[PDB]
Amino acid sequence: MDGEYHSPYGDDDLYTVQPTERSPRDPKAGEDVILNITTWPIENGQDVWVEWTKNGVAQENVTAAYDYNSGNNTYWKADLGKFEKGDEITYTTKGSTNGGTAYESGPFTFYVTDWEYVQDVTSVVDNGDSITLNMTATAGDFSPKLYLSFEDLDTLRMELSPTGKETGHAGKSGYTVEDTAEKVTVTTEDLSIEIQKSPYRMEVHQADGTLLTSEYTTANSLGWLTDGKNVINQYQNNFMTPSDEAFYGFGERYDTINQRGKDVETYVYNEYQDQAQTERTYLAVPFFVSANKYGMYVNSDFHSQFQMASKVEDKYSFVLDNDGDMTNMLDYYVISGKDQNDIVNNYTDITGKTTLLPKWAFGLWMSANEWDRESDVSSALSNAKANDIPATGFVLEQWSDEETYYIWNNATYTAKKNGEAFSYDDFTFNGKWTDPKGMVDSVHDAGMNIVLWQVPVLKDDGTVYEQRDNDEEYMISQGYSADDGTGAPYRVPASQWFGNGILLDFTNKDAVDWWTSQREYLLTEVGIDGFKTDGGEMVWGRDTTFSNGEKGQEMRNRYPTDYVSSYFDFAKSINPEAVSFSRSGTSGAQKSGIYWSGDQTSTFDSFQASLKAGLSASTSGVSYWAWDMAGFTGDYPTAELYKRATAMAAFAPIMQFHSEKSDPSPSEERSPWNAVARTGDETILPTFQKYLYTRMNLLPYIYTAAKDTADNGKSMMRQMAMDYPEDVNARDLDEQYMFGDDLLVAPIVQEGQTEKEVYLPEGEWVDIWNGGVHPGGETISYYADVDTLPVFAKAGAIIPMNMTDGYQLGQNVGNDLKSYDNLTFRVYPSGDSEYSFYDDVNGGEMRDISVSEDFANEKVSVDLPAMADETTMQVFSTEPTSVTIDGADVAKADTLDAFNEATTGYYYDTVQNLTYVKAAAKDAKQAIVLNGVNHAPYEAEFGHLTNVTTASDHAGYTGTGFVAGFDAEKEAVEFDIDAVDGASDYTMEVRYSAGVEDATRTVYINGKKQQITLPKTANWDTWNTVEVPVTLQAGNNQVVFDFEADDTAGINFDHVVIKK
Ligand SMILES: OC[C@H]1O[C@@H]2OC[C@H]3O[C@H](O[C@@H]4[C@@H](O)[C@@H](OC[C@H]5O[C@H](O[C@H]([C@H]2O)[C@@H]1O)[C@H](O)[C@@H](O)[C@@H]5O)O[C@H](CO)[C@H]4O)[C@H](O)[C@@H](O)[C@@H]3O
Ligand SMILES: OC[C@H]1O[C@@H]2OC[C@H]3O[C@H](O[C@@H]4[C@@H](O)[C@@H](OC[C@H]5O[C@H](O[C@H]([C@H]2O)[C@@H]1O)[C@H](O)[C@@H](O)[C@@H]5O)O[C@H](CO)[C@H]4O)[C@H](O)[C@@H](O)[C@@H]3O
Ligand SMILES: OC[C@H]1O[C@H](O[C@@H]2[C@@H](O)[C@@H](OC[C@H]3O[C@H](O)[C@H](O)[C@@H](O)[C@@H]3O)O[C@H](CO)[C@H]2O)[C@H](O)[C@@H](O)[C@@H]1O
């Protein structure tokens, strides 16, 4: 025999086992315990056995039985049997051939556990900032204590000490307690916590009595797993959930946005390509938000499983792991708030706010793994310029020596001992990188900022590489690695990414300072703008030990966030504009930069999973989220996928293209120019440009939303039920979302699709591209060819934009981040609305703008704050008869050219039905009033048409044209029209031409019929308006025009307008 091996926990992997583990790893009462053992080489006459004690008494040896052979190894199973709660088992596994040299593993000890639950509350002590509930247990000898405290008046914290020896934390004092024999009720202005005493059972209500959530009906819901003496290994609680309850968040999830029915693992993992199918993630957070208006956060870095009505149809549960330490309390929060987004804000109060990034982070990021030399960077920049792609971010991955990851590829130098840091001048730059500082300067010259790829591991591939070997020696001599549990440095398991590499212990501040010192010259001298901090899902092994005294079970989920945060803070300390770009983390990840959705293939299925990842991350407080648009690997995307992806990406928090392959031919860049080359579809370029230019037009809105995340916890991109939690149609939507406060975005994420269903919540929505009006409260069908993205603005929206003199979306304003071209506010008037604009160009002043819509009196008023810039309003309305600024008349400009020349003025855009109003910069509020205005027209051409078509061959129409002829039976034009100012009689203006003869049409108003007379117009180039009395109810009204048997003559039908 050459050896024997058994190790009960293997690498402690959640998903797999090594072939030499104990099963179960942590045996409970009544579970059969199997030991898997290996010997080598394969030989006759081998004996494998187990020497062991039960509660200190030597047992008869167990003989292991042959199981299987693989390679030059035999695998064996030894059966120890079942045990009782409290049993302490110690064993050693042994092997030898024909009574020769004996090889052994162990000794190993396990303590056999079972569940104990809270039984009754026996007394309650109110300490003014905390409440102690003294408890009995269902089994065992503990005297548990549950501590209640308020993180705020709407955020409840539970801390359980099974032994009673630990004490909970103080919280707010603003509560009262009604403590009776049978029940204790804890009340704040926001919450009513009702706790039955016998059996103990908690219900969490809002202050008005509405139930948020509650412990399971049968009580004994809250428990711990113990041997009663040495260990507590798990905690659980169990809660009642009705059949319609939806559960969102849990970090970044690829499979679904609503986790009901699933067991969700809070476990970071590097899963390539098939995250959705395996239900794995790089970014796992033990926090969810329910559409029943609460969130739950289990405050622990240990692995937890959330069982979301996956076992019992009306029960959800959490099972939280522990390392055995009996002094670690269970700590969790039930989180209420003013609305769903406020629940997320309260969660970020606990775990950390998003840090506002510089505005350059919100432009296009360009990346490709194949970029590996200065000529590649030069050509990326010149390709972007030649194709009018004004990006702001630039990533280099294949930049380094591929050994130290802090030295440029091909650089030569005198190696340094003892981990001493390099300066720029220590290097002779050669080959692929002759002048890194110059290269960076060229990136900056293009208006871009650059980040460099990093990992948290010291690579050790077993080869000789002087500087890396020097650094490894130094790192070990200082104790800068984690420890494997035996005194040796922890290494990533050999089969994994960077296997054999030594992790830097990011819990050790000295270690971090050393590691970052080696990169300092990249920031201070080369002038980089941050790091793409990749990896981090690299902590395996229960005995792996960190400088904070924590071990592998506790640190696996936390490690990536320690790593990412260390680098983010370090880069920012030198370069205040630095940005991190990362994939892995847990609670608190949001403090430290951008998160991208990792490694996915270029398919529509992947696109679907990416969108779910962003929407779940958003609920989990990770707002600055990116994805590799159209996928970074697999076969090159189709033109269709590339175009659909581009549109979504332009309307996502962070826009970035990227590609996996390191030296491919042809190129694998997901750049728009390479996509044209690879697909042969030249129309990719103008479509990409449209969406990129539109994003840059919206940058003032986007960046205000980024600040709103940082300040108020409102994520930039949100699943519909975050804004509409009571809306039954919004619960499961995963192919549309809100972007900022105002825009409903509905990407096409299905191959071959052109009829996109869009669910519109109650209220009026307006198509931002063309002014099409859509009353809410139904699913509409929107025709979207491959170049088209349905996007709608909600009623009352005030949307800041940076426009060219053309004043249309999708016109290139460039990538200047320090000035505006034409600062513009797009307004959809509806009652009184207000918006706080983040004017970052002018010192970050908040500009409070308000609009008062009064269409009943044919007026819209805008209260413009003091501004540093000329401003243009674009107000969705009919053409005013006059406009005043501070009471002073402003003249109508007849053309766009005249408007651009004017200092102040107004202009009416007939295509978009937008009134442009130009106001000078002034260090004082300005009152703008639009007079004689009504709600914008309902264009006939945007109506539901039956057997009738559109044209535009006679000038003077509004919108894009008119409905032509409309002069046979079974032809109809249907409008969905909102009552502008509630249920009332109104006048419907019908604008038409009838160049040959008097016409009539029939109209139905919510089923009520009348015939209208449309007198002849002089010719087909003359429009007239007839006023029709109608009666409209609140909200959406069905207005149907048709041509019936008693109607006559052709018309061209331009629009209708509703006015008082
Ligand atoms: O040149 C730097 C670096 O480039 C490549 O990795 C960057 C890549 O990392 C992340 O995805 C990776 C994935 O590409 C793949 O990598 C395996 C690969 O790792 C090393 O080489 C990397 C490049 O892949 C190189 O150092 C190693 O030398 C090589 O032998 C290996 O084949 O798989 C891992 C494991 O799943 C994955 O994490 C990142 O997500 C991605 O955006 C980035 O492009
Ligand atoms: O060039 C003459 C004429 O040609 C086209 O119409 C052919 C059509 O004419 C007569 O019926 C029309 C009817 O179709 C409808 O036309 C509305 C239409 O009028 C003008 O364009 C038409 C052509 O379509 C043109 O005059 C106008 O430019 C366009 O914008 C309008 O949509 O209504 C009128 C009035 O009731 C009627 O005269 C003719 O009777 C019929 O047989 C023939 O097919
Ligand atoms: O394919 C040769 C390549 O293999 C290894 O690197 C690859 C890397 O190039 C990348 O390839 C993506 C590619 O993977 C499969 O071939 C798949 O069928 C295809 O659709 C997809 O586009 O990613 C994989 C996985 O990360 C890497 O293994 C070698 O490292 C490299 O030397 C070789 O050139």
Ligand SMILES: OC[C@H]1O[C@H](OC[C@H]2O[C@H](O)[C@H](O)[C@@H](O)[C@@H]2O)[C@H](O)[C@@H](O)[C@@H]1O
């Ligand atoms: O720390 C290892 C090594 O780094 C530099 O050399 C890098 C590289 O230089 C040339 O390209 C050679 O052809 C390669 O063999 C080298 O790896 C230092 O100059 C060198 O002193 C040092 O040992």
Ligand SMILES: OC[C@H]1O[C@H](OC[C@H]2O[C@H](O)[C@H](O)[C@@H](O)[C@@H]2O)[C@H](O)[C@@H](O)[C@@H]1O
């Ligand atoms: O939101 C309004 C409308 O937008 C698109 O259609 C625009 C299209 O409408 C008519 O066909 C006009 O004649 C054209 O000039 C316009 O471009 C969507 O496809 C549609 O579904 C939506 O209702």
Ligand SMILES: OC[C@H]1O[C@H](O)[C@H](O)[C@@H](O)[C@@H]1O
């Ligand atoms: O093993 C290290 C190698 O990994 C990948 O293949 C990289 O593309 C290459 O640049 C590097 O030399």
Ligand SMILES: [Ca+2]
């Ligand atoms: Ca029209």
Ligand SMILES: [Cl-]
């Ligand atoms: Cl144990």
Ligand SMILES: [Cl-]
């Ligand atoms: Cl891995």
Ligand SMILES: [Mg+2]
């Ligand atoms: Mg709050």
Ligand SMILES: [Mg+2]
């Ligand atoms: Mg290259």
Ligand SMILES: [Mg+2]
């Ligand atoms: Mg700088």
Ligand SMILES: [Mg+2]
């Ligand atoms: Mg130490």
Ligand SMILES: [Mg+2]
């Ligand atoms: Mg689906």
